[PDB]
């Protein structure tokens, strides 16, 4: 017989389904501003009263 | 990452192996060695012998 050889190419593996690897959790990112206290002259401001 | 494929192997997969491709070809033709009851020319020695 002339041997019908295996033809052996990757069907063993390279496959495949789970090549979803790095899905984007960076979708999940946490931006915020360099958030203010706010000042106020308020405590700065005493009553200037007028005595009579 | 690097998929670790324990795959059918790339020179059996699309071949057929172990397998109808590796060709059990084998038609059971039973080798009849037919015996036949005869040596050859008994079946005729002209018997001159007439001995009168």
New interface residues.
Partial sequence: ?S??????????????GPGT?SRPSSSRSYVTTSTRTYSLGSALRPSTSRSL
Same sequence: chains 1, 2.
Wanted: net charge positive; aromatic share 12%.
């Fill in positions: 017989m041997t019908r050889s295996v033809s052996s190419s990757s069907y063993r593996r390279m496959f495949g690897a």
